[PDB]
Amino acid sequence: PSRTALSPGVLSPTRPVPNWIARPEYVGKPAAQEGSEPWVQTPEVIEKMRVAGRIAAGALAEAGKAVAPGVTTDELDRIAHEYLVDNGAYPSTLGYKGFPKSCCTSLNEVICHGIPDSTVITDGDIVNIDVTAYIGGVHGDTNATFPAGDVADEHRLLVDRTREATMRAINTVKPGRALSVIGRVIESYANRFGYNVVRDFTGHGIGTTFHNGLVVLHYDQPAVETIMQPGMTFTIEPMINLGALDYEIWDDGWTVVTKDRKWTAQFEHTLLVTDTGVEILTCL
């Protein structure tokens, strides 16, 4: 057997960031200034996104190394937060639309936007950690689902196959191809196993802003005409459900859970379209 349905815990105090680490403009505001930015980035922007992406990838891998039964999701946030701040990066989620922590930690039936807190990870859990770094005036965004202890076969396979769906979609990225191929490839692969790809959350353009108005769907919709062009930067980040897509949001206003409490998994990279293919910006 795996654990029972989760419930919310208590948050630790807000974690401080030294003042010399520049804040994104939305910290201390209720909304963000984003959604109308260009989709192709300039070379200077891309070079700063490589640095933000590598720092985000390091924070994700250090917090993912700590996933084990007995560890709290708050402890993963401490690790991610400190890694970012020691690298002179601001954690982009902290204060984004009022989100209270430096990463999102989404176990088991939590689709996304789980809030690090007193929740204890236990054997059989799958733990998505999602971290974004703002440094050099740009963002870098990555997430991965990590197993805790011995995970049941149905949940292990969901994680491995989500990871594979994400990588197969990244390996389609090429100038001249339709953006819609990413969702065609993810949903065709998911559907081989009878999984359902979440539709109401998507990937996005990213650059000087977190969510720049470019939308990357992870389901099949070939009517989108957007073409991948050199210098475009965006995420591929499918959330894949064992059960139905219906979902609810907890009273905290953030945590998104499957209504049937069946488990879900997600992986994410920030990508650059190159002249030949793709470059993953969120690698170690």
Ligand SMILES: O=C(O)c1ccc(-c2ccccc2Cl)o1
């Ligand atoms: O794009 C992401 O990878 C992501 C993870 C969390 C969020 C997010 C979206 C909307 C409101 C707040 C938050 Cl933290 O966005």
Ligand SMILES: O=C(O)c1ccc(-c2ccccc2Cl)o1
């Ligand atoms: O373990 C690996 O080698 C592997 C393949 C894909 C990923 C991964 C890591 C971080 C975020 C996204 C993805 Cl797809 O990690």
Ligand SMILES: [Mn+2]
């Ligand atoms: Mn993310």
Ligand SMILES: [Mn+2]
């Ligand atoms: Mn993202």
